[PDB]
Amino acid sequence: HHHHMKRKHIKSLIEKIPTAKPELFAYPLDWSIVDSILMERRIRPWINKKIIEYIGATLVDFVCSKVMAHSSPQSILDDVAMVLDEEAEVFIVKMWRLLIYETEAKKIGL
């Protein structure tokens, strides 16, 4: 189950993720699965790793807290655009694809 459920349903979970930004931003994200654990396990490091490509520190925690505050994807994007231009728009799209995939995967266990 460690990462076993994520790999086994690759065909199914990927179908859930919308390819259009407005549709994907509208996606009914279950924040109840977005808990304290999922942040340290997969989300927080993913953010910190992806931030290196754009810049080469303190901002990392800001983004985490906003996801934990269950903010609108567009609301965060606006705040990040103050730091990372139009690269910030590509940033959240890819993160939302992550959240959907993760949140959805822990539901597959039943």
UniProtKB/Swiss-Prot annotation:
Disulfide partners: none
Location within or outside the cell: Nucleus speckle; Cytoplasm
Domain PWI: 22-110
PTM characteristics: Sumoylated.
Function summary: RNA-binding protein that acts as a regulator of alternative pre-mRNA splicing. Involved in apoptotic cell death through the regulation of the apoptotic factor BCL2L1 isoform expression. Modulates the ratio of proapoptotic BCL2L1 isoform S to antiapoptotic BCL2L1 isoform L mRNA expression. When overexpressed, stimulates proapoptotic BCL2L1 isoform S 5'-splice site (5'-ss) selection, whereas its depletion caused the accumulation of antiapoptotic BCL2L1 isoform L. Promotes BCL2L1 isoform S 5'-ss usage through the 5'-CGGGCA-3' RNA sequence.
Domain-level remarks: The PWI domain binds nucleic acids with significant help from its N-terminal flanking basic region. It has an equal preference for binding to single- or double-stranded species, and it contributes to RBM25 role in modulation of alternative splicing, maybe by mediating RNA-dependent association with LUC7L3.
Subunit structure: Interacts with LUC7L3 and SRRM1. Specifically associates with functional splicing complexes, including Sm proteins and U1, U2, U4, U5 and U6 snRNAs. Associates with exon junction complex (EJC) proteins, including APEX1, DDX39B, NCBP1, RBM8A and RNPS1. Interaction with NCBP1 is RNA-dependent.
Protein's recorded name: RNA-binding protein 25
Species the sequence originates in: Homo sapiens (Human)
Organismal lineage: Eukaryota, Metazoa, Chordata, Craniata, Vertebrata
Parent sequence residues shown: 734 to 841 of 843
